[PDB]
Swiss-Prot record:
The gene is CCR5. Belongs to the G-protein coupled receptor 1 family. Receptor for a number of inflammatory CC-chemokines including CCL3/MIP-1-alpha, CCL4/MIP-1-beta and RANTES and subsequently transduces a signal by increasing the intracellular calcium ion level. May play a role in the control of granulocytic lineage proliferation or differentiation. Participates in T-lymphocyte migration to the infection site by acting as a chemotactic receptor. Highly expressed in spleen, thymus, in the myeloid cell line THP-1, in the promyeloblastic cell line KG-1a and on CD4+ and CD8+ T-cells. Medium levels in peripheral blood leukocytes and in small intestine. Low levels in ovary and lung. Changing residue 2 to S: In UGCCR5-145A. The chain holds residues 157 to 174 of 352 of the full protein. It is found in: Cell membrane. This is C-C chemokine receptor type 5. It is linked to Type 1 diabetes mellitus 22: A multifactorial disorder of glucose homeostasis that is characterized by susceptibility to ketoacidosis in the absence of insulin therapy. Clinical features are polydipsia, polyphagia and polyuria which result from hyperglycemia-induced osmotic diuresis and secondary thirst. These derangements result in long-term complications that affect the eyes, kidneys, nerves, and blood vessels. Induction: (Microbial infection) May be down-regulated by human cytomegalovirus/HHV-5 protein UL78. Interacts with PRAF2. Efficient ligand binding to CCL3/MIP-1alpha and CCL4/MIP-1beta requires sulfation, O-glycosylation and sialic acid modifications. Interacts with GRK2. Interacts with ARRB1 and ARRB2. Interacts with CNIH4. Interacts with S100A4; this interaction stimulates T-lymphocyte chemotaxis. (Microbial infection) Interacts with HIV-1 surface protein gp120.
């Protein structure tokens, strides 16, 4: 969800790892 939104992609990084 975060990835799609303009918000920070921090969460996305966690999903994959670091």
């Amino acid at each position: 969800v975060f990835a799609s939104l303009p918000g920070i992609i921090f969460t996305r990084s966690q999903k994959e790892g670091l």
